């Protein structure tokens, strides 16, 4: 499944371009409280519920991969564009306004 950057975030090792670890944060229907969170590590993935104002004990699952099961799609203007720039370019923003 694909997830947007408004719900999943991932750290990158700038030495190797490998994803280090990543978090999925489900805001509730209110769009302001995180009602569950999931952490992807290289060895395993684990998840907390956040009903009743504080984290429940995490459920967990291993996956045995050498690497975290998250892959970044990115827009990439250049080789220098290490994290990928928005396609709504600053000149197009300027002529829209």
């Amino acid at each position: 499944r694909v997830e947007p950057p408004t719900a999943l975030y991932a750290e990158v090792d700038p030495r190797t371009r490998k994803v280090l670890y990543a978090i999925r944060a489900i805001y509730g229907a209110d769009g302001n409280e995180i009602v569950s969170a999931t952490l992807y590590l290289p060895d395993t993935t684990m998840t907390w519920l956040r009903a009743e104002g504080e984290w429940e004990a995490p459920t967990s699952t291993p996956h045995g991969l050498e690497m975290v099961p998250v892959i970044p799609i990115s827009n990439r203007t250049r080789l220098s564009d290490l994290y990928g720039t928005s396609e709504i370019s600053p000149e197009l923003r300027s002529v829209t306004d």
């Binding site: 769009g31 009743e52 104002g53 504080e54």
Partner: protein
């Protein structure tokens, strides 16, 4: 016993060995568990900006 510097005998208490015979550091076996808020348990959290 003998003086902590005795001329005839080499002892672990002698000032001569003070660089080597240190006590080893260990886990704090008495470490207190962290507190937590009680209000955030009993009060319903309301989503807010």
């Amino acid at each position: 016993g003998f003086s902590a510097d005795h001329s005839q005998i080499a002892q672990t208490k002698d000032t001569m060995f003070t660089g080597y015979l240190d006590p080893v550091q260990a886990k704090d076996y008495f470490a207190e568990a962290e507190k937590t808020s009680i209000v955030q348990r009993v009060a319903q959290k309301i989503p807010m900006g």
